[PDB]
Each structure stands twice: as structure tokens, then as C-alpha cells.
Amino acid sequence: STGSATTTPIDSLDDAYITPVQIGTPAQTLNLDFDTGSSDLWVFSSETTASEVDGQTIYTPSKSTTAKLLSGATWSISYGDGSSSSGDVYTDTVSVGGLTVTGQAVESAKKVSSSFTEDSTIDGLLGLAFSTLNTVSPTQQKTFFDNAKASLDSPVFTADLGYHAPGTYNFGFIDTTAYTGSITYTAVSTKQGFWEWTSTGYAVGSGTFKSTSIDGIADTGTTLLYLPATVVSAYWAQVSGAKSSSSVGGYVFPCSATLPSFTFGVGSARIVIPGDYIDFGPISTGSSSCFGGIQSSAGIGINIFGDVALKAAFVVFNGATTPTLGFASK
């Protein structure tokens, strides 16, 4: 089997991407944030505290003839940005772009943090990291991909995010028309539960390539690119007036600037992030200071190849017995 679904930026800055997902019988369609950096599928629901729902579409298990309470199971998650949610669990039928999984754990939110409430476009998350990170207790649950894997034509999914434009998540096949040149595959460590890999280095604009190993995770659920302070300082030093601001919480730059590209290494291959991708606009409406798309990972404990990097490539998440990650230009 295969699946193919379009993913769409939630705003003009590509802060996140939503993908329609069919849950239950008859289908309830929710727009979920596909997140290769976590492993819970959770949704706003009829059980979510009323004061914490503001515009989201909710899942109502009582209206689904295939919904079954997973008795005694609970979940609680907190993400890198400090946001969080928790609740209980149902199993139900879940379909993504024509691909159907029966008995999928659907984690129903009883509580969500303010940042989720304030984001009316995101009805939940669909985690695509390794199932060892799933937070359901006392019986850990499998991701949508983990459950679907045996039925897929090939045990893979691909992320093809657009720059200020829709993109595609495919399951079970590699669309050879969706990229240029060849796909370079690189080793993955699952020891932390992430799609963790090691980049071979970087370049700033037209500068010489610096060979240096940068361990990080491929995370569609993170907006920006987070790299070691040395690398990030080298990038912003090429932008007149750019500086790190503690009050804003990262590197800002003059909105009048033209940003240089940023290249990262995948084995012997190179992925180029256009300068425009690194511009996240005025820090506040009307401001002449703009927020940078490349930021320091120093206060995170891990480097994160988020959407800024990933949208510059066609990315293959290979969930074979020995998982690997593939990158192609597009």
C-alpha cells in the first residue's frame, strides 16, 4: 500500500505545516502537524478542557463507530519550546492520503498549553519519530508509520516541504519526479529515539565549505535550523547589522538586508538553503528588525535540522531494519 497527502503552511512564514488526517468512522478530518521529532499522535477532542479550545476542529470518539477506549492508558508530553499536552487514549481507524491504519492509538487531549490553544490552525500532532519515544503509559503505543510499515510497498516515508507553498508527505514509495539529481543516504542513530544523523559540514553563501561533523536530528515539527554557536556566528557575521538579542531570544537582522545562502553537507553531497528561506520577518508588526531562521542550539542540548533546512530538500525517512536518511536537491 501507499499514501500521499498534501501539507500546507499554517501562515505566511511557514511556522508549521498541517496535513489533513481522517480519523474514525464516518471520517472526522483533522489537520495535524506531522512531526518527525516526536512519536505521539494526539488531537484536540470532545474531552479537551473547553477554555483551552479556540477554533480547532475536535475529534469526538463517541461519534465514531470504530473508536474504542484504550482502557487505563494515559499520555503526557512536553516539547522543546515548553509547550505540552496530556489526556487519555482511544484506538481508531486513521487514514493519511489514502493509507489506512486500523487500531491506531489516538491520544485524546484533556489538557493543552496556551501555545496550542492560540494556534487555531493545528488540531493535533502526528508523530513520526521512533516509537520508543511514545509517551503512552503503561503500554507504549506505535506511531502511525510503525503500524503502517508492514503493509507499505516500501518501509519509507518522504517529506517534501514547500517554501511559502504546499508540499507533500508520501508513504511507502519514493517519487522520483519530485527531486533533481540523486538521493544521498546517510546513517541514522536511533539511540535517542530521533532521526539522528551527522552532517559533514557547512558553507556560508559563496564561502568555502567547512568540513566538520555536526550531529543533529531531522525534525519537521521544528520551524528553524538550530546549529552550534560557532556555525551560527559565522553565518550572521556575513549580514551587516545582525546580532543576537537576549530580549528577542535569538539572532535578529535588519529587514533591509539581503541574506546569504547556507549550505549543509550530506556525505559528499550539498544541500543549499536559499537566503530567503532564512528570513522570518519582522519580530513584531511593522518592526525593522527581522528574526533569523538560523539560530544557536546552545541552550537545547541538540542540533535540530528543522523546516528551514528540510524544505530545501527532498527527504527520505527510511525505516528499514537499519534506518537511514536520504537527501536530494529539488
Ligand SMILES: C#CCN(C)Cc1nc(C2(O)CCNCC2)cs1
Ligand atoms: C534531547 C533533548 C533536548 N530537548 C528537551 C529539546 C528538544 N525538543 C525537541 C522537539 O520537542 C521539538 C519539536 N518537535 C519534536 C521534538 C526535540 S529535542
